[PDB]
Ligand binder design. Sequence first.
Ligand SMILES: [Zn+2]
Ligand SMILES: [Zn+2]
Ligand SMILES: [Zn+2]
Length: 138
Amino acid sequence: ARIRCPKGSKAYGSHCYALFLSPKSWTDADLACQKRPSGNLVSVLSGAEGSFVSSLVKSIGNSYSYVWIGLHDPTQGTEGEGWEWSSSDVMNYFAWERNPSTISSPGHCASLSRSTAFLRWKDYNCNVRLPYVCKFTD
Ligand SMILES: [Zn+2]
Ligand SMILES: [Zn+2]
Ligand SMILES: [Zn+2]
């Protein structure tokens, strides 16, 4: 109604968000998020949502510099329009630190980078285990 979420997550818009510190590869993180109702690694569909997600993670801590979000490229470079959100939302907002199309052999998953105050996206090796943010409904 006035948007409430489960203990352990935060509301924004019509969604609940939760940061998990025990690191997982991109695929394992998204699968973990899917345990939740309409859950998936967070999709960032507006600058406003980007700022909110940023505030959610800013206090993670020195040990972590990258956090998984739900953007990946199933074409593994062969496409650079192969990127998509695991939630299947239309890619209507773009916040790359450096566009992957300017990178030779970029990572095929995207993470929020501490260098950009977690407001921008960095191509990253999908197999690396990182903390991650889930976006779901309650
Ligand atoms: Zn949803
Ligand atoms: Zn996909
Ligand atoms: Zn590659």
